[PDB]
């Protein structure tokens, strides 16, 4: 029996848990009332918070199910570890340990490696495992380049482009993005910016889309400079530059229909496309779909030499 530690940033499971979630993200400081209410407003705006946490749960359960289905060597048992929501990463490691798991494979629900996301989770996990003793975790570090994951986005882009009118098809701009992080990740030689660029190149070339740009989104609000340009500004500059009639956003850095996509893309980016004369396109996110879950299974099996 192999442990399958699936990690993510996490989103509150209940509306009532948003403040604690915000407090945790703020490292122990309660959000100001206005700050808090505004986050609550954004979840409402996208339909409510309830469905969100459930996607991550299904991604992990389905990956567990599929892995145990496609091969008969290893029996996997999924354990979800979240950065800012319970169960926390350490809690999930403590539970695998308590359950008698001695070997575990972990994967983060973010294809691109970065010190702040992927590396941070793996470290916290391997550290709690050492402290407990007798449990070794083999961690996946990046998987933006898994042929099957690339193909999932390639087909979705091909579909969207073949689905637009000719006036737009040949005057469109593809925007591949990921979650922004403080520029100071450079101090650690964080390849994250490069991985989004390769991720973008792979998808555009695969879909045969010639015009594309790389952007960042959802930067947090801190004193430090975050990776840019942001998808909002990038869209505007490319429109003033060449007058694109359609913008196709591929938030490849995200795996589900969370706030960053439903709101930061579907809303804020459409605002710009609306404020300008272009049409808004954002292909279906991976979520827990079979094609995506198979890609992840393949990622996990490869990591194990299977
Ligand atoms: Mg924002």
UniProtKB/Swiss-Prot annotation:
Phenotype for residue 260 to Q: Retains 21% of activity
Pathway annotation: Porphyrin-containing compound metabolism; protoheme biosynthesis
Residues reported to bind Fe-coproporphyrin III: 9, 26, 42-43, 50, 121
pH dependence: Optimum pH is 7.2 with Zn(2+) and protoporphyrin IX as substrates.
EC number: 4.99.1.9
Gene disruption phenotype: Deletion mutant requires hemin for growth.
Location (main, coarse): cytoplasm
Location(s) in or outside the cell: Cytoplasm
Listed name of the protein: Coproporphyrin III ferrochelatase
Organism listed in the record: Bacillus subtilis (strain 168)
Lineage: Bacteria, Bacillati, Bacillota, Bacilli, Bacillales
């Amino acid at each position: 029996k192999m442990g399958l530690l699936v990690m993510a940033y996490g989103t509150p499971y209940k509306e009532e848990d948003i403040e604690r979630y915000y407090t945790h993200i703020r490292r122990g400081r309660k959000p100001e009332p206005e700050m808090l209410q505004d986050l609550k407003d954004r979840y409402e705006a996208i339909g409510g918070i309830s469905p969100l946490a459930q996607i991550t749960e299904q991604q992990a359960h389905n990956l567990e199910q599929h892995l145990n289905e496609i091969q008969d060597e290893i029996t996997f048992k999924a354990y979800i570890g979240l950065k800012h929501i319970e169960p926390f990463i350490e809690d999930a490691v403590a539970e695998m340990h308590k359950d008698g798991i001695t070997e575990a494979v972990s994967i983060v629900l973010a294809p691109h490696f970065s010190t702040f996301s992927v590396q941070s989770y793996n470290k916290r996990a391997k550290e709690e495992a050492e402290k407990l003793g007798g449990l070794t975790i083999t961690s996946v570090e990046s998987w933006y380049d898994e042929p099957k994951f690339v193909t999932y986005w390639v087909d979705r882009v091909k579909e969207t482009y073949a689905s637009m009118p000719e006036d737009e098809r040949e005057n469109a701009m593809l925007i591949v993005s990921a979650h922004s992080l403080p520029e100071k990740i450079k101090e650690f030689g964080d390849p994250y910016p490069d991985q989004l660029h390769e991720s973008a190149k792979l998808i555009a070339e695969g879909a045969g889309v010639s015009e594309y740009a790389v952007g960042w989104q959802s930067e947090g609000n801190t004193p430090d400079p975050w990776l840019g340009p942001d998808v909002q500004d990038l869209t505007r500059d490319l429109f003033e530059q060449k007058g694109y009639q359609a913008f196709v956003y591929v938030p490849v850095g995200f795996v589900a229909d969370h706030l960053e996509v439903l709101y930061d893309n579907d809303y804020e980016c459409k605002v710009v496309t609306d404020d300008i004369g272009a049409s808004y396109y954002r292909p279906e996110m991976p979520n827990a779909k079979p094609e995506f879950i198979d890609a992840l299974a393949t990622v996990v099996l490869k990591k194990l030499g299977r």
